[PDB]
Curated annotation (Swiss-Prot), chains A, B, C, D, E:
Residues 116-196, 270-350 are cytoplasmic. Pfam families: Innexin (PF00876). InterPro entries: Innexin (IPR000990), Pannexin (IPR039099). It is found in: Cell membrane; Cell junction, Gap junction; Endoplasmic reticulum membrane. It is a multi-pass membrane protein. The lineage of its organism: Eukaryota, Metazoa, Chordata, Craniata, Vertebrata. Keywords: Cell junction, Cell membrane, Endoplasmic reticulum, Gap junction, Glycoprotein, Ion channel, Ion transport, Membrane, Transmembrane, Transmembrane helix, Transport. Glycans are attached at N52. GO terms for cellular component: endoplasmic reticulum membrane; gap junction; plasma membrane. It comes from Homo sapiens (Human). This is Pannexin-3. Residues 42-94, 218-248 are extracellular. The gene is PANX3. The chain crosses the membrane at residues 21-41, 95-115, 197-217, 249-269.
Length: 350, 350, 350, 350, 350
């Protein structure tokens, strides 16, 4: 029971998982599409060499014109003195670099803030289960006392007496939360991961703006082979002119990546903003019970605190641990009420 | 028992599962067929270049004419000044976009309304099994009292006394259903998912009506290569005329998608209408027992309510849980009768 | 025990399963063969273009003549003014449509009549095992009474007394069968599924008689390319004449499908006939036992009733459940008899 | 223990399993070899067309001459007016038909005689284990009386008394075997399956004798393309003459299939003959045991009875069930004897 | 414990398994290599046709010359009037035939001598474990008697008395072994399997000596195409002369197979000779314990008896069953001793 609970513990908020998967898979899918196009077309570019050229000579011209992009510029009939067509060649490599960059912050978070968070979460839930049991066991005596005397004054007095009984409030958790309220490691790692994601998105925007808009269309370009030693060969032409077939795929890939990351920006902004605000209905729900009372009194402090991230993970987990299904219904009963404690105790016993 | 039961709980209905599968598989199947045709034909189009052109020059003409669809229009000998043949090139990408759009509402529903619904279903069934056990436990005393006195007046009086005994009616369920009847999150998500499906179907209709009917046949088109820098090349022709071989596949894909989504429309309309009416024979069947009676008196309210969706999921689930295997036969016995309670109690005990 | 039993419950039948498998596998296998032939031949058709045509122009002619089947009708040199050769191109698509049509009634039956039948079978067998145990429990007292007095008059009197004892006859089963005898959902679904199978078989017959017999042989056909915008090109011929290589595969596929469905027709007719008659030796076998006696008195009514389908499934299942291996031997003993009950009781106890 | 025994029960004998496997594997393996040759050669036939013909025209001639086998006869330079070369084209299809035909009787046997045989076998073995236990339980008293009195007269008298005690002889088994001696379903299915196998073997012999010997060698054949519309084409030759490369593979396949089925004939003859004779040493072994004595006295009748098949499967199964390893040694002891019963009882107890 | 022992029983010896694997896999590996060479070379042979021949005509010549090996001889420039080059074509088929022939005796042995041997082995080991336990249980009394009186005369007298006690010597095993001494089925099957292996090895030697040495080198051969109907074709040459590329692979395959089977011959001879001699140190080791004494004194007759095979399998199995690790150490103690019995008894007790 315990071990399976530890394995099922969540250390990555459900919403951020989709962002991780998208930001790490989209460049990979685009790169796979680029490779598929490259291997389907046979040749990345095709050139219009004279009829005299044999098949081998034409293949040599194609290869030398396609491989001379990273090295020398090539100019089409709509451009200035020079235009750089290199991004056509360095597209899959840039996609690999972008995928690695996007995966890097995930690795940073996992290696830097998985173990402490796991330990804190497991310890807190282990304490909280028995804390809830101990809080519940007094409800029977509370109900008997209420039945004996119906006035509310005695009820409030006995509630105060139970609170002061010192049989609970777990001074361990009080000190632990007091210490955590000053810790900043988890918030630091979270904010750093989000900021890295945003910085890399801006970097991709800059890359696709500086190096892809200039040659976005660039239908054809006039290559040359005489730059090498074979300048005394009159057989070859001077300015063999040709084009590149994967231009449409390049344009698509670029636009698709831009759109995907524009979509992803606001999600990351919301994820970062989640820390600025303390986790409000649930707070009023859990304030009543002494077990959750201790951790609900810390909202006076600044929102940016390690406990805040721990609070987010507790809210994410407790939704499925099992301990949440009861107090929610109990507080729904309280809200509906103009008896409730007796019904809650009966349900818990059942 | 509880574990496997909560694993086996269904949260997507049986009928909507087929629609979800179809609306995401059909576009993928059509895309796979398009890619298979592309890689089987070797080239997407073939052009009738002069005999002087070598193999490499002919391949260059083919590639430049096939890649100049998204960029420039091409006109056949039956059209107006201009006709756009770009939908031929952007078919698989549009199919991918449509598949993602159709899959989006499923993800929205699963991320937005799976956990609350799961918790509500689990709590309701867990309480309902105990409610049924407690209710059936009193049939023995009912039988003894009925045997002692045969008149129906005493039977009715004792039935009222049992109802007022207060040993059941579970004030938890009463207040839970009262709260649910005002909630609108589940109905909102359901209606939003259905409306998204309808809107995306209409969008596909518009896309295939605007950008496929104009060039539905468009056998051939007249391409040109002189638009580039090689406008001084007298060797090449001026208006190389050629065609595209995947026209039949394009026409099929379009018609097939239109037919599939026309088929799917009415199913989604029925799914949306399901909420407009409360789930009648089963209602009369389950009204008798006190356990199901409590949720059977909420029919007065507006049909649109969170409880209605939960009612649908309970009806879908109880049909296989096991709890329904008895009351149906008991109410069949009641219908047959001009003793029945005794037979039902004996069957339950057995 | 109960779990594995309900997993092993059969809800299709041993015979109709083979028809279900064949009616879907045959079109799929034929389509796979057609695709294999298409990808092995490389070119679905080959045309006899002049020697002047280069390789690219010849490939263009092949593609344009093969793609102009579904759009225009081509004329062979043995025919009337015009003949339609489109079924050659639309063969695998028609096979896919036929496979989907064949699979549709199976899905209808599974989604429409699997759950009610499963529940009815489960309840009936669960009650019948206990009924058999209770019935056999009295054989000991019957044996003692028979041993005490050897005359047959007292034996018959005690048999009547046991029948009237009211310790069995399970009024639940009586009313359940009475209600079922009026139900018609299961018979309706069964008849609808079989009728859909027959209608689709007739539709395939019509399709292969209208659109395959006319062009069954159609060795060659005279194609044309000047219909496009190369009508002023004197280089091309006027009426390039050519043939299609997969003609034999087409002929085979057609004949094979016709034969397979002709074989399948009588099986479905027999499946429909199975409902018109109640299942006779087994009835005389099971009449004696009181538990089986109740369900054996309902044949006075029309054979077309919901209970009839449930009776068929009971006969199909009980053959392997275990509850049948004994009564068969007991009734074999009864037939062999000119003691038997004592031997049966001893065997059951052992 | 029981369930695993039921699963491990053999229902197809060990010898006929090899014939079943071979009669289906051989045609499938030959078909796979034919397809491998077809896809390795690239062209099923190659033709010697003039040098003027381009590559496309030569491929057209090849395809039209290879596809005109099933349609029109082709004559080689050693034949009469006409010879039919169709069997070259319809070889893999004929192999598929033969494989399906050979698989059909197996399916008939499995669907028609598996369940009754399984039920009879399981019932008989379940009764026989208890019968053997009861029979051996009396060996202790037999040994005691034999020790008390050494004369053989008292031994025989006590043997007769034990036989008449009526504590065994299981009247159930007697009546069951008496009923089975008249049943003919199992022998009918067995003989029908064997006769179907023999008939299909003879059919293959006829097919390979009528349609393969005539054109067994048929090196080359003179094709023609002018039969179509292009009879005014002076360019093409009149009687293009060519050959087929897979002739050796065809010859092999034919000879191999003939040899395999000639090998299989005698095995099936022996399988059929197995029923004509009752299974003798084992009968003398099992006659002594009272449990096996009952079925031993049933060979007075005709060997062709249902029990004969049941006897064959009992002999096949008991060899591994466990109930055979002891009585064989006991009867070996009896044969060696000029004490043995005491040793057998001690071994059984141990 | 028992069942796993039955599954782990060895029924094929450790040495003959390697011979089986080699003799069944070597031809398969050589066939795979031949097929790989065939599919890597593209054309099994290449011919030097004139320059006038187009590509299609050259391919036709290649195919017609390669396919005319099994039909007509081809003569090279070093040979007599005729030489047969067919073995080049039938090499993989001959390898398949050889593999099937080598696998046949294995199947014969497994189908004909696995069940009886398995039953005998399991029965013998089951009896022998109890025999060993019963024999060792008397060592305690033997030790007590030896301690009471130290003289060897009383020790020998008590040993004889224990041997005559009749509490062991298991007349079951005595009679079983006496019967087995006359059985010959197992030795017959073993000798037949070995003789089949030797005969098939000799057959391969004959096949490779008659049909491979004559044309072992045979670099080239002069083919002809005019033998058909194109004898009036002046365009074709008369005696197109060409070679075959897989000659080296053929030579290798042949030499490798010869070497492998020459290696395998002596191993099979040793396996056959194994039966001629009874298995000697172990015989003296087991001559002591009464459990193994019974089977040790059954060696007086001819070594070729059924028990001999049973003895071989017992020796092979007991090495790992567990029942041998003790008596070996006890007899080592006996050999080392000039005390040994006392030490062995103390070790057993410990
Ligand atoms: C074509 O070839 C000739 C001779 O090889 C050469 O003189 C001429 O320059 C070539 N054409 C071009 C455009 O270079
Ligand atoms: C064929 O080639 C010649 C010279 O290479 C050129 O003048 C002519 O225009 C070409 N014909 C076409 C139709 O392009
Ligand atoms: C053959 O080619 C020449 C020149 O390319 C052309 O004039 C003639 O029409 C062609 N033959 C046919 C049958 O079209
Ligand atoms: C070769 O081609 C010429 C012209 O294309 C034709 O007249 C002649 O008949 C052809 N040769 C044969 C054998 O058909
Ligand atoms: C070359 O071809 C011509 C005609 O195409 C033919 O007459 C001659 O015999 C061929 N050469 C040889 C060596 O056969």
């Amino acid at each position: 029971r315990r071990g399976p609970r530890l394995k099922g513990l969540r250390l990555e908020l459900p919403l951020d998982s989709i962002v991780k998967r998208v930001a790490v898979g989209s460049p990979l899918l685009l790169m796979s599409l680029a490779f598929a196009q490259e291997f389907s077309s046979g040749s990345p570019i095709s050139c219009f060499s004279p009829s005299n050229f044999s098949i081998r000579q034409a293949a040599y011209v194609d290869s030398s014109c396609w491989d001379s992009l990273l090295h020398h510029k090539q100019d089409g009939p709509g451009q200035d003195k020079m235009k750089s067509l290199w991004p056509h060649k360095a597209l899959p490599y840039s996609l690999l670099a972008l995928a690695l960059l996007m995966y890097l912050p995930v690795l940073l978070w996992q290696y830097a803030a998985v173990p402490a968070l796991s330990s804190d979460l497991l310890f807190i839930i282990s304490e909280l289960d028995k804390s809830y049991n101990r809080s519940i066991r007094l409800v029977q005596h509370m109900l008997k006392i209420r039945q004996k005397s119906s006035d509310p004054y005695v009820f409030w007095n006995e509630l105060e007496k139970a609170r002061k009984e010192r049989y609970f409030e777990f001074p361990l958790l009080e000190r632990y939360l007091a210490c955590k309220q000053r810790s900043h490691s988890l918030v630091a790692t979270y904010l750093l991961r989000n900021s890295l994601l945003l910085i890399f998105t801006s970097a991709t925007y800059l890359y696709l703006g500086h190096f892809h808009l200039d040659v976005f269309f660039q239908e054809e370009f006039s290559c040359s082979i005489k730059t090498g030693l074979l300048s005394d060969e009159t057989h070859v032409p001077n300015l063999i002119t040709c084009r590149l077939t994967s231009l449409s795929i390049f344009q698509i890939v670029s636009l698709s990546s831009v759109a995907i990351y524009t979509i992803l920006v606001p999600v990351i902004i919301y994820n970062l903003t989640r820390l600025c605000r303390w986790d409000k209905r649930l707070l009023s729900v859990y304030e009543m019970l002494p077990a959750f009372d201790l951790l609900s009194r810390k909202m006076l402090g600044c929102p940016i605190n390690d406990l805040n991230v721990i609070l987010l993970f507790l809210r994410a987990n407790i939704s499925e641990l099992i301990s949440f299904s009861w107090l929610s219904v109990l507080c729904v009963l309280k809200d509906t009420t103009t008896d409730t404690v007796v019904d809650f105790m009966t349900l818990l016993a059942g």
